[PDB]
Amino acid sequence: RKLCSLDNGDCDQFCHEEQNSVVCSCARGYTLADNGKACIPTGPYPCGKQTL
Amino acid sequence: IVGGQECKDGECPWQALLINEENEGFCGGTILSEFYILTAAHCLYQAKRFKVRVGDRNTEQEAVHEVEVVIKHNRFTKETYDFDIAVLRLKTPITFRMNVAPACLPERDWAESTLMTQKTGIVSGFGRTHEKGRQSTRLKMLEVPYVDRNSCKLSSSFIITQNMFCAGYDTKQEDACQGDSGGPHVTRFKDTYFVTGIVSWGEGCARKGKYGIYTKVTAFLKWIDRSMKT
Ligand SMILES: CN(C)C(=O)c1ccc(N2CC[C@H](NS(=O)(=O)/C=C/c3ccc(Cl)s3)C2=O)c(F)c1
Method by which the coordinates were obtained: X-ray
Percent helix / strand / coil, chain B, rounded to 5: 15, 35, 50
The answer to whether B182 touches B40, Cβ cutoff 8 Å, is: yes
What value does the CA radius of gyration of chain B take, rounded to a whole number of Å?
Answer: 16
Instruction: Give the span between the Cα atoms of B94 and B158, in whole angstroms.
Output: 38
As for chain B, the residues directly before each break of C–N over 2.5 Å are 62
Catalytic residue among B56, B65, B73, B84: B84
Type of residue found at B123: V
DSSP SS3 for B149: helix
Range of the domain at A2: 1-52
Instruction: Give the span between the Cα atoms of A20 and B56, in whole angstroms.
Output: 47
DSSP B94-111: ---BTTB-PPBPPPHHHI
Number of domains in chain A: 1
Closest CA to B141 of B26, B8, B17, B51: B8
Report all structural domains of chain B as residue ranges with CATH numbers, in order of start.
Answer: 1-12+103-218 (2.40.10.10), 13-102+219-230 (2.40.10.10)
DSSP SS3 for B163: coil
DSSP B48-70: SS-EEEES-SBTT---EEEEEEE
Ligand 1 atom with least separation from CA of B211: 22
Q: With CB atoms and an 8 Å threshold, state whether B114 touches A28.
A: no
- State the CB neighbour count (10 A cutoff) for residue B47: 16
CATH number for the domain including A34? 2.10.25.10
DSSP SS3 for A25: strand
- A41 φ/ψ angles, rounded to the nearest 5 degrees: -60, 145
Question: Which residues in chain A touch residue B10, judged by CB atoms under 8 angstroms apart?
Answer: 50-52
